[PDB]
Amino acid sequence: GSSGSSGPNFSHWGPPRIVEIFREPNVSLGISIVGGQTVIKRLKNGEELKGIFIKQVLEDSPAGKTNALKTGDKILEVSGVDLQNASHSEAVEAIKNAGNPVVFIVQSLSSTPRVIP
């Protein structure tokens, strides 16, 4: 264990996923994000996450149709912009200032998507 590992099948985050989302006029991408911090106490030590995570995704949106993005996910990059350590606003501007199309690089935790009605 030259490095060590801690996590007996707990919140196992698989590999990243790239998805191209085309922004809409009247309506936005239809994606949201929670929290959003860029600076936190150093001494702090834990296993939690601070990165940007999908807050909520609409249905009548370009992101809700791709069925490749859902609330809870962890956005690591968008349109080729590192939003991991990016605050709530730092990430927002990225999605709004993402050179269309708007690519999304997140990682869906050990879970399963949903089917259409």
Side-chain angles (χ1 to χ4, degrees):
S2 273
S3 177
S5 187
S6 57
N9 202 299
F10 208 56
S11 196
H12 206 110
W13 301 79
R17 37 166 41 69
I18 284 176
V19 187
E20 270 149 38
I21 326 173
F22 260 77
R23 37 167 190 84
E24 285 273 295
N26 304 297
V27 61
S28 210
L29 260 192
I31 317 172
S32 296
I33 48 172
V34 331
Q37 316 207 58
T38 177
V39 157
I40 315 167
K41 210 272 280 279
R42 160 62 79 196
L43 271 86
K44 196 189 84 150
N45 83 267
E47 63 150 275
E48 306 271 310
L49 31 295
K50 50 270 276 197
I52 318 309
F53 298 63
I54 306 189
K55 160 55 204 90
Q56 139 161 346
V57 158
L58 298 66
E59 187 162 348
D60 84 316
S61 112
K65 293 203 206 279
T66 83
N67 250 350
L69 311 158
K70 326 279 271 185
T71 188
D73 270 277
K74 180 180 158 84
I75 315 172
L76 325 150
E77 211 194 50
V78 97
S79 209
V81 83
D82 199 74
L83 296 189
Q84 279 175 60
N85 286 291
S87 83
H88 210 222
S89 288
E90 293 271 303
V92 158
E93 311 212 5
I95 290 88
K96 90 188 280 155
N97 302 307
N100 182 302
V102 189
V103 200
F104 268 81
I105 311 207
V106 305
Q107 325 198 232
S108 158
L109 270 175
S110 166
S111 171
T112 52
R114 168 69 201 182
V115 68
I116 89 90

Short mmCIF file of all heavy atoms in Angstrom, two decimals, residues 4-13 47 110:
data_model
loop_
_atom_site.label_atom_id
_atom_site.label_comp_id
_atom_site.label_asym_id
_atom_site.label_seq_id
_atom_site.Cartn_x
_atom_site.Cartn_y
_atom_site.Cartn_z
N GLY A 4 -2.03 3.45 -0.41
CA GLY A 4 -3.16 3.14 0.44
C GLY A 4 -4.49 3.44 -0.23
O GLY A 4 -4.57 4.30 -1.10
N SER A 5 -5.53 2.71 0.18
CA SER A 5 -6.86 2.89 -0.40
C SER A 5 -7.93 2.78 0.68
O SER A 5 -7.88 1.90 1.54
CB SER A 5 -7.11 1.86 -1.49
OG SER A 5 -8.33 2.11 -2.16
N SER A 6 -8.90 3.68 0.63
CA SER A 6 -9.99 3.69 1.60
C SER A 6 -11.33 3.94 0.92
O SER A 6 -11.60 5.04 0.44
CB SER A 6 -9.74 4.76 2.67
OG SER A 6 -9.59 6.04 2.08
N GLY A 7 -12.17 2.91 0.88
CA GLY A 7 -13.47 3.04 0.25
C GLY A 7 -14.03 1.70 -0.20
O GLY A 7 -13.99 1.35 -1.38
N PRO A 8 -14.57 0.93 0.76
CA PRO A 8 -15.15 -0.39 0.49
C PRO A 8 -16.45 -0.30 -0.30
O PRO A 8 -17.53 -0.55 0.23
CB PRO A 8 -15.41 -0.96 1.88
CG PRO A 8 -15.56 0.23 2.76
CD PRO A 8 -14.65 1.28 2.19
N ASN A 9 -16.34 0.07 -1.58
CA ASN A 9 -17.51 0.20 -2.44
C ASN A 9 -18.42 1.32 -1.96
O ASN A 9 -19.64 1.16 -1.89
CB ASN A 9 -18.28 -1.12 -2.48
CG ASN A 9 -19.15 -1.24 -3.72
OD1 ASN A 9 -20.06 -0.44 -3.94
ND2 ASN A 9 -18.88 -2.25 -4.54
N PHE A 10 -17.82 2.46 -1.62
CA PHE A 10 -18.58 3.61 -1.14
C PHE A 10 -18.42 4.79 -2.09
O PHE A 10 -17.33 5.32 -2.26
CB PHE A 10 -18.12 4.00 0.27
CG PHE A 10 -19.19 4.67 1.08
CD1 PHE A 10 -20.41 4.05 1.30
CD2 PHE A 10 -18.98 5.92 1.63
CE1 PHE A 10 -21.39 4.66 2.05
CE2 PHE A 10 -19.96 6.54 2.38
CZ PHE A 10 -21.17 5.91 2.59
N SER A 11 -19.53 5.21 -2.70
CA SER A 11 -19.52 6.33 -3.63
C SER A 11 -18.42 6.14 -4.68
O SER A 11 -17.68 7.08 -4.99
CB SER A 11 -19.31 7.64 -2.88
OG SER A 11 -19.65 8.75 -3.69
N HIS A 12 -18.33 4.94 -5.23
CA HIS A 12 -17.33 4.63 -6.24
C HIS A 12 -17.61 5.41 -7.53
O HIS A 12 -18.55 5.10 -8.26
CB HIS A 12 -17.31 3.13 -6.54
CG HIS A 12 -16.00 2.64 -7.05
ND1 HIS A 12 -15.15 1.84 -6.32
CD2 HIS A 12 -15.38 2.84 -8.24
CE1 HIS A 12 -14.07 1.57 -7.03
NE2 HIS A 12 -14.19 2.16 -8.20
N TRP A 13 -16.78 6.42 -7.79
CA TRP A 13 -16.94 7.24 -8.99
C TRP A 13 -16.18 6.64 -10.16
O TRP A 13 -14.95 6.66 -10.20
CB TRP A 13 -16.44 8.66 -8.72
CG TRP A 13 -17.17 9.34 -7.60
CD1 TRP A 13 -16.96 9.17 -6.26
CD2 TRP A 13 -18.22 10.31 -7.72
NE1 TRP A 13 -17.82 9.97 -5.54
CE2 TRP A 13 -18.61 10.67 -6.42
CE3 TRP A 13 -18.88 10.90 -8.81
CZ2 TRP A 13 -19.61 11.60 -6.17
CZ3 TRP A 13 -19.88 11.82 -8.56
CH2 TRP A 13 -20.24 12.16 -7.25
N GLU A 47 -12.68 13.39 3.27
CA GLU A 47 -12.87 12.61 2.05
C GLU A 47 -14.01 13.20 1.22
O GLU A 47 -14.25 12.76 0.09
CB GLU A 47 -13.18 11.15 2.40
CG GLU A 47 -14.46 10.97 3.19
CD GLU A 47 -15.13 9.63 2.91
OE1 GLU A 47 -15.89 9.54 1.93
OE2 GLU A 47 -14.89 8.68 3.68
N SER A 110 -21.93 5.14 -8.92
CA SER A 110 -22.50 3.81 -9.10
C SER A 110 -24.02 3.86 -9.06
O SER A 110 -24.64 3.67 -8.01
CB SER A 110 -21.98 2.86 -8.02
OG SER A 110 -22.74 1.67 -7.98
#
